[PDB]
């Protein structure tokens, strides 16, 4: 459905600064966060494609000040099989 934006920070503090800057700089929805162990937490915003492209690069620039940003990626159309298996906050 809606587009998918992600910030992965080694550290919880650099993720919340990323998750705060993404919802302020666009009309996106912070659906949750994923703790994959080892100190890799991942903020997931999810809205329309022109805003999540502006949310993450306002969140990547804001999370490199305080944390260790591992990966940033924006998916314009996530396929419907991704939203049904992986937990991106739009599970049918």
């Amino acid at each position: 459905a809606d587009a998918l934006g992600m910030i992965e920070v080694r550290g919880f503090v650099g993720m919340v600064e990323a998750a705060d800057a993404m919802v302020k700089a666009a009309k996106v929805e912070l659906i949750g966060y994923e703790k994959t162990g080892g100190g890799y937490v991942t903020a997931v915003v999810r809205g329309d494609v022109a805003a999540v492209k502006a949310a993450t690069e306002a969140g990547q620039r804001a999370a490199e000040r305080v944390g260790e940003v591992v990966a940033v990626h924006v998916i314009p159309r996530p396929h419907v099989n991704v939203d049904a298996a992986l937990p991106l906050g739009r599970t049918p």
């Binding site: 302020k24 009309k27 022109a50 502006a54």
Partner: protein, 202 residues
């Protein structure tokens, strides 16, 4: 001294509407070829206006004798008439096409997701369309001030944005554009490609 000489070959609708809202003269309609001339000193523009009106069939809207500069906007449906008025204005000033200053973009900022408290200050201090909260904003300043209307014209000509405010006269030429993020990105790219592709004296 010729600062700004730009020929708008077609007025887009929101630009024609903003000029009709803020013009001290005979109002323009969309589709007309416009022509902006900004000179130094400020009071020779009366003789320039007289020469243009005795030469051609053009119709003036904006002619502001400011604190230090002077501006003139003639427009008509016939692009040949507007270019003939431009040739008459150049021959009265005894300058050429490339005697104009080359416009330089000083500031090109995009202020995405403007919060409402900033929107109210922006649009209380504007004449054009209102900015809604959450929409993006493109501010712009060009030197000299007359090229901001060229920037607004080409930015509306490419993308689909809202014109908030443009200032054709002064030491700096402001331009406020509002819309969604991709549309403001397209209008910013088009206005930047419009300004720096203009020849003249550096």
């Amino acid at each position: 001294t010729l600062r700004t000489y730009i020929f708008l070959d077609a007025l887009q609708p929101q630009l024609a509407t903003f000029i009709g809202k803020t013009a001290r003269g005979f109002l323009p309609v969309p589709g007309q070829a416009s022509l902006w001339v900004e000179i130094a000193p400020g009071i020779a523009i009366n003789r320039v206006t007289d020469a243009a009106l005795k030469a051609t069939k053009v119709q003036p809207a904006v002619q502001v004798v400011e604190r230090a500069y002077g501006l003139l906007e003639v427009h008509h449906f016939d692009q040949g008439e507007v270019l003939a008025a431009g040739s008459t204005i150049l021959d009265k000033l005894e300058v050429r096409e490339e005697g104009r200053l080359k416009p330089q973009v000083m500031t090109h900022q995009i202020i995405r997701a403007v919060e409402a408290y900033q929107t109210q200050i922006i649009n209380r201090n504007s004449q054009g369309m209102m900015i809604l909260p959450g929409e993006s904003l493109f501010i712009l300043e060009t030197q000299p001030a007359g090229y901001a209307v060229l920037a607004a014209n080409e930015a509306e000509k490419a993308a689909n944005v809202h014109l908030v405010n443009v200032t054709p006269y002064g030491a700096f030429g402001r331009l406020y554009l509002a819309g969604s993020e991709a549309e403001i990105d397209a209008a910013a790219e088009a206005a930047e490609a419009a300004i720096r592709s203009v020849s003249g004296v550096a």
